[PDB]
Amino acid sequence: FVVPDITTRKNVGLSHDANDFTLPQPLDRYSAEDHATWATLYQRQCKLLPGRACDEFLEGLERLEVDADRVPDFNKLNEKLMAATGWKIVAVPGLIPDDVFFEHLANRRFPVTWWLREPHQLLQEPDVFHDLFGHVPLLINPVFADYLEAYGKGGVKAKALGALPMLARLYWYTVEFGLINTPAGMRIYGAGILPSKSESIYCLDSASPNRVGFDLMRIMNTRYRIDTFQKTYFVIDSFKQLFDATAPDFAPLYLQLADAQPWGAGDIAPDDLVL
C-alpha cells in the first residue's frame, strides 16, 4: 500500500506559495506533544554537543534565544537574526524546488520546514528540529552567512550548465556534513550531524569514516548517500577558508566535472589529505 508521507500528513489544510513556497508559521498546529518533543531533542543535543559542536554553533543557539522548551516562534528569532547578519528564516512545508531554495538563500532567507517529527520517530525528511536547530545558529556568523548567500547566488549559473548536482555535493559536504578542525580537536558544523544522537558521536570518535581536507574540485566530484552515516567527512580550517575557496568562477570547473567519473561516497582519492 501507498500511504501519505509525513509531509503530506502534516500539511493537511495548509497552503504554500507556487512562487516562493512559504507560508506563515502555523503556531496553532503545534501540540503539547510537539513542544515536549522539541524540548526532549533540544535537551538531548545540548548535553551531547559540548566539545563536539564547534563553539560558534553553541553560541548561536544562545544569541538567537532558541527556545529550549517549545518549538520557536520564527518571527521572534528573526528579530535577533536580522540584527546580527540581515538574514531571516521563512517557513516552508518541507522539501521545496531547488531554484526556490537557491533564490531564498541568494536573498538571505533560510527555508525551514515548519512541522516536527513525531515522538515515535525521534527520520530522513528534514523537520523543524533539523532545519532550525541544525542549520540556523551559524547564520549569526557573518562569514558563514556570506557563504550561504554566495551559494544561493551560484544556483543560477549551476542550473544553466546542468551542474546543480555538483553544487548539491558541495552543500552536502559542507553545510550538511562538514567538520572544522581546531587546535582543541576536530569539531562539527554540519547541520545534518548536530541534531543527531548517534552520527555526532561517530563522526568524531569512530576510526571508520575518512576525514579528508577540504578540496573544492574533489568534493564537487564526490557522490553521497542520504540514508546512512557518511563514509567521508570533509574538514575545513575556518569558515573564511571555505568562503575564499568557493569564490572563484565555477563555470570551467563544472564543464570539467561534467566529463568526469565521480568518486563513491567511501572512496579515498589519490590526492586526499587524510586527517
Which residues contribute to the site for ligand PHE (CB under 6 A)? Answer: 150-151, 154, 157, 170, 246-250
Residue 48 or 143 with smaller CB distance to ligand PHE = 143
Angle (deg, nearest 10), helices 142-153 and 74-85: 100
Residue 82 or 247 with smaller CB distance to ligand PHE = 247
In the complex, minimum distance from the CB of residue 168 to ligand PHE, in angstroms, rounded to a whole number: 11
Indicate the burial class of 145 (C-beta count within 10 angstroms; 0-12, 13-18, 19 or more): buried
Instruction: Say if residue 120 carries a ligand binding annotation.
Output: no
Instruction: Pick one of ligand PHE, Co ion, none as the site partner of residue 234 (Cβ within 5 to 8 A by kind).
Output: none
In the complex, minimum distance from the CB of residue 143 to ligand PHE, in angstroms, rounded to a whole number: 12
Residue bearing cell 544561493? 152
Closest residue to Co ion in the complex (CB): 191
Residue 119 or 248 with smaller CB distance to ligand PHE = 248
Residue 96 or 191 with smaller CB distance to Co ion = 191
Residue 46 or 168 with smaller CB distance to ligand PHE = 168
Q: Side chain identity at 115, as an amino acid letter? A: W
In the complex, minimum distance from the CB of residue 119 to ligand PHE, in angstroms, rounded to a whole number: 37
In the complex, minimum distance from the CB of residue 110 to ligand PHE, in angstroms, rounded to a whole number: 15
Report the C-alpha gap between 121 and 104 in whole angstroms.
29
Instruction: Say if residue 135 carries a ligand binding annotation.
Output: yes
In the complex, minimum distance from the CB of residue 167 to ligand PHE, in angstroms, rounded to a whole number: 6
Report the C-alpha gap between 116 and 113 in whole angstroms.
8
Report the C-alpha gap between 68 and 207 in whole angstroms.
33
In the complex, minimum distance from the CB of residue 207 to ligand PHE, in angstroms, rounded to a whole number: 31
Closest residue to ligand PHE in the complex (CB): 154
Dump the DSSP string for 203-256. Answer: HHH-SSSEEEE--HHHHHTB---SSS--SEEEEES-HHHHHHHT-S--HHHHHH
Q: What is the rounded end-to-end Cα distance, in angstroms, of the chain?
A: 46
Instruction: Say if residue 130 carries a ligand binding annotation.
Output: yes
Q: Side chain identity at 81, as an amino acid letter? A: L
Binding mask 84-103 for Co ion (x = CB under 5 A): --------------------
Residue 42 or 172 with smaller CB distance to ligand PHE = 172
Instruction: Pick one of ligand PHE, Co ion, none as the site partner of residue 129 (Cβ within 5 to 8 A by kind).
Output: none
Angle (deg, nearest 10), helices 164-171 and 251-258: 100
221 pairs with which residues across the strands? none
Angle (deg, nearest 10), helices 164-171 and 142-153: 160
Query: Which stretch in 111-119, 162-170, 187-195, 224-232 sits in contact with Co ion by CB under 5 A?
Result: 187-195
E strand or H helix at 91: strand 88-92
Give binding residues for Fe cation as ranges: 130, 135, 176
Give binding residues as ranges: 130, 135, 176
| Contacts with Co ion, residue ranges (CB under 5 A) | 191
